[PDB]
Amino acid sequence: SHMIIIKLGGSFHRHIVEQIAEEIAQFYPDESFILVHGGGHPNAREYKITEGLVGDVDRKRIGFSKTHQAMLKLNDLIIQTFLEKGLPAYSVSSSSIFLLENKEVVYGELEILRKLLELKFIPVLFGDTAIALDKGIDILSGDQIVSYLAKMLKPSKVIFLMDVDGIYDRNPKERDAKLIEELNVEEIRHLLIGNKLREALKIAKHSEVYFINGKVKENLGKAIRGEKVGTRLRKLE
Amino acid sequence: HMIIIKLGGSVISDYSFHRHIVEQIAEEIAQFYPDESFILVHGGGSFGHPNAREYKITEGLVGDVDRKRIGFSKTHQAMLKLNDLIIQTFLEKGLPAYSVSSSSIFLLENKEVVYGELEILRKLLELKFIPVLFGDTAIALDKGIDILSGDQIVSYLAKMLKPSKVIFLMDVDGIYDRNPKERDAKLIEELNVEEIRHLLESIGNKLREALKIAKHSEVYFINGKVKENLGKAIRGEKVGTRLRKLE
Numbered sequence: 001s002h003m004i005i006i007k008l009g010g011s012f013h014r015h016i017v018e019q020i021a022e023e024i025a026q027f028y029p030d031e032s033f034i035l036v037h038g039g040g041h042p043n044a045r046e047y048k049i050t051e052g053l054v055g056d057v058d059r060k061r062i063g064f065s066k067t068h069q070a071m072l073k074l075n076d077l078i079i080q081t082f083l084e085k086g087l088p089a090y091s092v093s094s095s096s097i098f099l100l101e102n103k104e105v106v107y108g109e110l111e112i113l114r115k116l117l118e119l120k121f122i123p124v125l126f127g128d129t130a131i132a133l134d135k136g137i138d139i140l141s142g143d144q145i146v147s148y149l150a151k152m153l154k155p156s157k158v159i160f161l162m163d164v165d166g167i168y169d170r171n172p173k174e175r176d177a178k179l180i181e182e183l184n185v186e187e188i189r190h191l192l193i194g195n196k197l198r199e200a201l202k203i204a205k206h207s208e209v210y211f212i213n214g215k216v217k218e219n220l221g222k223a224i225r226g227e228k229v230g231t232r233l234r235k236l237e
Numbered sequence: 238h239m240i241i242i243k244l245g246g247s248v249i250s251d252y253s254f255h256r257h258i259v260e261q262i263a264e265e266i267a268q269f270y271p272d273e274s275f276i277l278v279h280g281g282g283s284f285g286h287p288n289a290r291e292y293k294i295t296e297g298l299v300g301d302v303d304r305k306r307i308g309f310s311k312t313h314q315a316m317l318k319l320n321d322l323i324i325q326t327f328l329e330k331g332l333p334a335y336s337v338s339s340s341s342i343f344l345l346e347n348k349e350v351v352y353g354e355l356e357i358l359r360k361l362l363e364l365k366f367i368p369v370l371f372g373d374t375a376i377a378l379d380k381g382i383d384i385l386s387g388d389q390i391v392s393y394l395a396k397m398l399k400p401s402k403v404i405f406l407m408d409v410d411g412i413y414d415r416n417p418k419e420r421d422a423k424l425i426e427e428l429n430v431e432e433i434r435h436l437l438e439s440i441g442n443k444l445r446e447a448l449k450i451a452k453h454s455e456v457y458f459i460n461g462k463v464k465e466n467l468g469k470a471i472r473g474e475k476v477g478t479r480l481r482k483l484e
């Protein structure tokens with residue numbers, strides 16, 4: 001309905017979080033917002049959590065817990081930044097409501113998020129460690145959380161704040177690239193970032209998708225208002 | 238074949254830290270893990286209680302609802318901080334404790350859980366993890382925002398998963414005659430519904446939750462500041478107050 005999901009990339013830059021909160025404050029509270037950020041990941045690679053519950057099991061469990069705690073610290077920093085700006089952002093543990101199989105959320109709990117949104121709260125989830133029915137433990141990325149929430153909650157739009165202006169033709173590092181302001185299935189179906197494109201193809205069934213540069217503040221508001229900004233992938237037909 | 242250990246807010250804290258007794262509980266549990274499953278619900282402590290009192294969370298979403306939402310989030314963050322302390326302490330002792338946000342799976346009505354999600358907890362206990370829940374802020378359907386105590390969490394988990402025993406760690410050796418402040422008080426070794434009811438006619442919440450829990454599990458009330466007390470409570474040994482399973 002009148003709900004918007006916002007996903008954040010990677011860097012801790014406090015000023016950019018301040019800008020994101022200030023832009024979100026333009027539509028609170030008559031517009032519902034769910035926030036999702038990413039890594040914590042250093043512990044994810046150091047403990048090879050994606051390897052599963054194989055080999056040294058106890059060390060993998062300890063690293064699972066430590067990575068979750070580091071993600072909680074980063075999430076608390078973001079939460080306090082949002083709270084100082086007068087926004088009631090509430091932390092929701094992703095690993096406490098989600099269960100994966102093959103890097104995909106196959107079990108979820110969403111009544112708590114619904115009651116948070118109803119009471120004019122802003123839930124904030126994170127890419128996190130997670131329990132996986134196949135290989136015991138796994139790393140759940142924020143893109144999968146966004147995909148599941150789009151499957152179930154069906155937001156009005158999903159906005160990805162990236163380090164670059166949006167989806168490009170060539171690699172942004174390889175100059176002479178061009179920006180695609182209007183994205184559709186045929187262009188996304190070019191895979192020779194990729195996982196984000198597959199998740200966007202899955203999400204466009206339910207909601208509009210925006211890819212905008214989070215470094216520019218006003219950008220966020222534009223994507224929420226529907227103005228031309230970055231890359232836009234409309235709802236599929 | 239599952240044990241639920243509740244840690245009082247006044248034993249593991251009081252803005253004190255009390256890391257020594259947390260290490261003690263960690264070693265006591267390590268004496269039994271992995272051959273046994275443990276859920277640990279730690280109390281509010283000196284972290285979420287001051288914020289809840291200052292922002293008046295238990296009153297609900299009334300008056301200054303914006304400031305109350307801000308205080309809701311701040312209290313949740315303080316409880317997450319204390320949970321990080323406890324979980325790090327449990328991790329350095331070689332035990333795999335994992336955080337579960339109580340406010341992320343529970344929904345309250347009249348100071349008790351009326352909506353819950355336990356599949357994540359089940360999968361955590363299956364994979365030989367130790368889940369660490371805590372008293373928290375909570376979304377209440379009647380008053381909007383409320384404070385969910387660890388006792389109600391333990392009661393809901395007991396009526397849900399049906400553990401073998403539920404062990405409370407308190408400041409005192411267990412349940413006494415009257416207030417242990419009075420000098421003519423004697424610890425009860427075997428509790429029953431009669432002396433319970435006779436005592437409430439004069440903690441209150443602990444006794445109600447224990448009366449509900451005894452329908453599913455055996456209750457223990459012991460002093461958490463002593464080492465072997467937890468281990469004696471894990472077995473059927475005589476320690477503190479014992480409330481046998483209802484029959």
Ligand SMILES: Nc1ncnc2c1ncn2[C@@H]1O[C@H](COP(=O)(O)OP(=O)(O)O)[C@@H](O)[C@H]1O
Nearest residue numbers: 008009010038163166167168169170171172193
């Ligand atoms: N065609 C493209 N358009 C935009 N970015 C691209 C493209 N190809 C590669 N990239 C790069 O891929 C990266 C995607 O960011 P990513 O690490 O996936 O974010 P997250 O960690 O949030 O998933 C960007 O930093 C960008 O430089």
Ligand SMILES: Nc1ncnc2c1ncn2[C@@H]1O[C@H](COP(=O)(O)OP(=O)(O)O)[C@@H](O)[C@H]1O
Nearest residue numbers: 245246247280408411412413414415416440443
């Ligand atoms: N009959 C009794 N037996 C034991 N403790 C009692 C009794 N009457 C009063 N108390 C006091 O009540 C307190 C109970 O604390 P409690 O509220 O259970 O802690 P928490 O807030 O962590 O649940 C104890 O510290 C104890 O001093």
Ligand SMILES: C/C=C/COP(=O)(O)O
Nearest residue numbers: 038039040127128141142
């Ligand atoms: C613990 C880290 C999980 C991954 O986070 P993310 O890919 O970038 O959204």
Ligand SMILES: C/C=C/COP(=O)(O)O
Nearest residue numbers: 246280281285372373387
């Ligand atoms: C922020 C409040 C948490 C609950 O406190 P508790 O009584 O002692 O379990």
